[PDB]
Amino acid sequence: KVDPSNPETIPKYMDELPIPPVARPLAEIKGSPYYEIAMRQVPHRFHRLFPPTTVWGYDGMLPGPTIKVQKDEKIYVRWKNKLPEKHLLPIDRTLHETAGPPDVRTVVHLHGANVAWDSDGHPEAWFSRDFAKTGATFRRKVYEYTNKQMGATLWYHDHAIGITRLNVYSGLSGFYLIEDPVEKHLKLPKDGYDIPLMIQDRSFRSDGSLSYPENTNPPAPVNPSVQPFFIGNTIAVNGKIWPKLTVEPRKYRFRILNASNTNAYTLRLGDGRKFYQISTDGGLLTEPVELTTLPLEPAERSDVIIDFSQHKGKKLILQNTNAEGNMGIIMRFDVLQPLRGRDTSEIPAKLISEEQVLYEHHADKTRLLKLDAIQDEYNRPVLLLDDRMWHDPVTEKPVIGDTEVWKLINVTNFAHPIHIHLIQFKILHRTPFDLERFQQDGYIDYTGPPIEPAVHERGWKDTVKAEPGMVTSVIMKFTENPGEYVWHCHILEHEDYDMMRPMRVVE
Ligand SMILES: [Cu+2]
Ligand SMILES: [Cu+2]
Ligand SMILES: [Mn+2]
């Protein structure tokens, strides 16, 4: 008997990985596509032998439909809250905007978008059902995505203040792909050989319902209470637990996204088989990079090419080397489909034809930004950026035209994936420091030389693993779109209490 709450009873590899359908526009105005995407409560089956689970899905599907655009192609999206009045999951009423009704508030952030602030999905721009109540920064029912950025695998997800962890866990995320003009003249695997992989950890009650904590263990006196992490006991890809993908012995492009609330994975293919990275969060690399492991924190993504042609007749497990047991397994590739005509795809010698260089010594401004926790009056951790809470006066006010270096000083014992909106950055380096000395008097005593970014994280990025006991330095240049944005940890349990700060980009 399969008990959804007991992962040892779940037979792995029973579900063929699904491909989310592509969103179709409802209209086109003067050449601009118009989409209408409604958030709905629906059943979704996470495993062949599970009962249906009630979830929240964009257009009633999990993952949400994949939106595809060209670079520089302006589109309009009316994101609609068509959800019930009561939440699926427990709400901590001590957080932002959760004291009373409306409980079900939504706003959609296109993660990685170069977009004007009023279509960025600001956390205070949320709306209840049919826009009946709206947050203070609400501006547009119909968002406008101008897409003036390098081609990339982006993703969209809920960002409503105080409940982002709940709305994303309930199912509100999907892929958004910007095609670069270069790709038309490359021969990357395409069409059915270009497959997105949304990796997420989940836990379930015995009746198949989504399980999310009511409180910590041991419990806080607040009920329900936020917990500063969520680690599931199953891994799903594209909404199916421990699936298989039946592939031909040829090359595929996989668009790999960690859309988990907290958990990070280190991907390994079979017995350390090689695969070829072609993009990071922000777009294509200069040239493919040979990898045998791929670490991904929440919100990080990378596109890779895997060649199955030398693996005909094999089944290869995609491992998560961060964990033992069942959580060490993501999915299985079954190289068992007969080849459907010749593989004409190629791993190219170069991907893009231009690269923008940013130099640390050209920085117009340098920010030292601590990642830490305090204890609240209930003895719960509050995760904080720069000693400040969300509602404290804005301190990050980057100026258009300026090059900035941000130094993320992680004084906690765990990594935090820090996401900066509107821009893409390059990781400069990480440098270890003496944690106890910093705790004593705030002096940064470096205990070793700077370490370069690892080989899989050298492209343009918007989410960076800030390692504990290290200063992680990133570099960026602000070029357009002044307005009200944010930066935050992408562990959603941290973002919601309270590890998010305003970023006011100014002219
Ligand atoms: Cu964090
Ligand atoms: Cu965000
Ligand atoms: Mn995001």
Tell me the CA–centroid distance for residue 139 and ligand 2, in Å: 17
Superfamily of domain covering 7-181: Cupredoxins -  blue copper proteins (2.60.40.420)
Q: Which ligand is nearest to the CA of 491?
A: 1
CA separation for the pair 491, 371 (Å, rounded): 13
> 218: cis peptide before it, omega within 30°?
yes
Tell me the CA–centroid distance for residue 244 and ligand 3, in Å: 27
Q: Which ligand is nearest to the CA of 418?
A: 1
Three-state helix/strand/coil letters over 128-184: CHHHCCECCCCCCCEEEECCCCCCEEEEEEECCCCCHHHHHHCCCEEEEEEECHHHH
Q: Which ligand is nearest to the CA of 112?
A: 3
Tell me the CA–centroid distance for residue 414 and ligand 1, in Å: 8
CA separation for the pair 348, 338 (Å, rounded): 25
Token pair 């990071």 in the structure block, residue: 280
Tell me the CA–centroid distance for residue 151 and ligand 1, in Å: 28
Tell me the CA–centroid distance for residue 411 and ligand 1, in Å: 11
What's the alpha-carbon Rg for the chain, to the nearest Å? 22
CA separation for the pair 214, 90 (Å, rounded): 6
CA separation for the pair 323, 405 (Å, rounded): 33
> 468: cis peptide before it, omega within 30°?
no
Tell me the CA–centroid distance for residue 156 and ligand 3, in Å: 7
Tell me the CA–centroid distance for residue 281 and ligand 2, in Å: 14
Cα of 302 vs its chain's centroid, Å: 11
Tell me the CA–centroid distance for residue 164 and ligand 2, in Å: 9
CB 67 within 8 A of CB 35: yes
Q: Which ligand is nearest to the CA of 489?
A: 1
Tell me the CA–centroid distance for residue 490 and ligand 2, in Å: 7
- Give me the half-sphere count of Cα atoms (radius 13 Å) on the Cβ side of residue 337: 16
CA separation for the pair 162, 36 (Å, rounded): 25
Tell me the CA–centroid distance for residue 185 and ligand 2, in Å: 33
Tell me the CA–centroid distance for residue 489 and ligand 1, in Å: 5
Tell me the CA–centroid distance for residue 415 and ligand 1, in Å: 7
Contacts of 153 (CB under 8 A, 6+ apart): 175, 177, 196, 255, 257, 279, 281, 301, 303
Q: Which ligand is nearest to the CA of 301?
A: 3
Listed residue (416, 410, 420) closest to 475, CA to CA: 420
Tell me the CA–centroid distance for residue 364 and ligand 2, in Å: 25
Tell me the CA–centroid distance for residue 443 and ligand 3, in Å: 32
Domain 360-505 indexed as CATH 3.20.20.80: no
Could you write out the DSSP letters of every residue in 269-334? ETTT--EEEEEETTEEEEEEEEES-EEE-TT-EEEEEEE-GGGTT-EEEEEETTS-GGGGEEEEEE
Domain 191-335 indexed as CATH 2.30.30.90: no
Q: Which ligand is nearest to the CA of 465?
A: 1
- Give me the half-sphere count of Cα atoms (radius 13 Å) on the Cβ side of residue 378: 18
Beta strands per DSSP E along 185-241 = 194-202, 234-237, 240-241
For this entry, resolution in Å reads 1.4
Domain coordinates in residue numbering, the chain: 7-181, 191-335, 360-505
Bridge pairing between strands 500-505 and 470-477: unpaired
Helix, strand or coil for residue 215?
A: coil
CA separation for the pair 507, 121 (Å, rounded): 21
Tokens of 346: 């190629």
* Count of beta carbons in the 10 Å neighbourhood of residue 114: 22
Tell me the CA–centroid distance for residue 20 and ligand 3, in Å: 19
Q: Which ligand is nearest to the CA of 495?
A: 1
CA separation for the pair 175, 197 (Å, rounded): 9
Listed residue (496, 408, 499) closest to 165, CA to CA: 496
Task: Answer yes or no: same fold for 7-181 and 360-505.
Answer: yes
CB 325 within 8 A of CB 272: no
